[PDB]
Design a protein around this ligand. Structure first.
Ligand code: HEM
Length: 293
């Protein structure tokens, strides 16, 4: 037995309404450019979308993006979510201007908007997540640990119904942003263009010279002399031969990575949700640049 969560469109809303919310998110991303030593909010909004979706458990349909339960203190204060409060704060004035959007739609849309405005692939997005009460908040401990190996990673993502290609594609979002010692016990960026969505994660895995070192929090991480880092779970993608093949494919085909990531990311964000046969089709929002805005 799993719960059923049926998508229900915010009353009377359509594509145009959500493009306006997209636009407000994108404009604030542009405006608040100084955040995190001028990386900007794009990376933390992508991580917020993934962590608010990544609690899902296919076996009983608990967790997931539908209920928007990050707004409750058990989930806000999950140690795995340390740092995401910055993303939530960013989204607060968006929610105040557009109070009709559900929290789950806002957290997932923030992720879509971030990826597209950082020049990533289009991510089709569906509305209709509905806020659920505090007691539906999943317990802490459903997001992955970083200090583990490929077997861990593979098994972990089975709970989110992701296969090896989906796992490797999703991990490419680590092109974005950085680890912050005070949030996670790890420090450093994975690459140079921290706020541009590219296949750089895979090129860096394959092409940098990596050394297993201890950081200031006494945790192991792989460091390169270009000043990049990889988590043990990131590095596992080149230690496992099946993952490694996929890493090589994405390192050598930007388009393929973009298409696979778009599919897996939408999937991640939609897991657990039942869409009525007559629900609207997925929206594909225009970027500001495409709109001349
Ligand atoms: C084995 C799975 C994964 C693990 C262990 C993991 C672990 C981490 C850790 C420890 C950080 C740094 C948090 C910081 O200190 O602020 C991080 C950052 C980040 N992660 Fe992951 N991650 C994984 C999967 C993913 C996936 C699936 C995505 C999205 C598709 C994602 C997107 C990000 C983003 C964009 C950031 C940078 C946030 C920022 O700069 O604020 N991660 N991740």
């Amino acid at each position: 037995t799993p719960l059923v969560h049926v998508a229900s469109v915010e009353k009377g809303r359509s594509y145009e309404d959500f493009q306006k919310v997209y636009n407000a998110i994108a404009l604030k991303l542009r405006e608040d450019d100084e955040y995190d030593n001028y990386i900007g909010y794009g990376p933390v909004l992508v991580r917020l979308a993934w962590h608010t979706s990544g609690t899902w458990d296919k076996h009983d349909n608990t967790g997931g993006s539908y209920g928007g339960t990050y707004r409750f203190k058990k989930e806000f204060n999950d140690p795995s979510n340390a740092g995401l409060q910055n993303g939530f704060k960013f989204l607060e004035p968006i929610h105040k201007e557009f109070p009709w959007i559900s929290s789950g739609d806002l957290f997932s849309l923030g992720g879509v908007t971030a990826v597209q405005e950082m020049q990533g692939p289009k991510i089709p997005w569906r509305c209709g997540r509905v806020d659920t009460p505090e007691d539906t908040t999943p317990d802490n401990g459903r997001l992955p640990d970083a200090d583990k190996d490929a077997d861990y990673v593979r098994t972990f993502f089975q709970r989110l119904n992701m296969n090896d290609r989906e796992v490797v594609a999703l991990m490419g979002a680590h092109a974005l942003g950085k680890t912050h010692l005070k949030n996670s016990g790890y420090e450093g960026p994975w690459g140079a263009a921290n706020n541009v969505f590219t296949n750089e994660f895979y090129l860096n895995l394959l092409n940098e010279d990596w050394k297993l070192e201890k950081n200031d929090a006494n945790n192991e991480q792989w460091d390169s002399k270009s000043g990049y880092m990889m988590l043990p779970t990131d590095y596992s993608l080149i230690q496992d031969p099946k993952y490694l093949s996929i890493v090589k494919e994405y390192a050598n085909d930007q388009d393929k990575f973009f298409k696979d990531f778009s599919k897996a990311f939408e999937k991640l964000l939609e897991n657990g949700i039942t869409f009525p046969k007559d629900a609207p089709s997925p929206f594909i929002f225009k970027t500001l640049e495409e709109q001349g805005l």
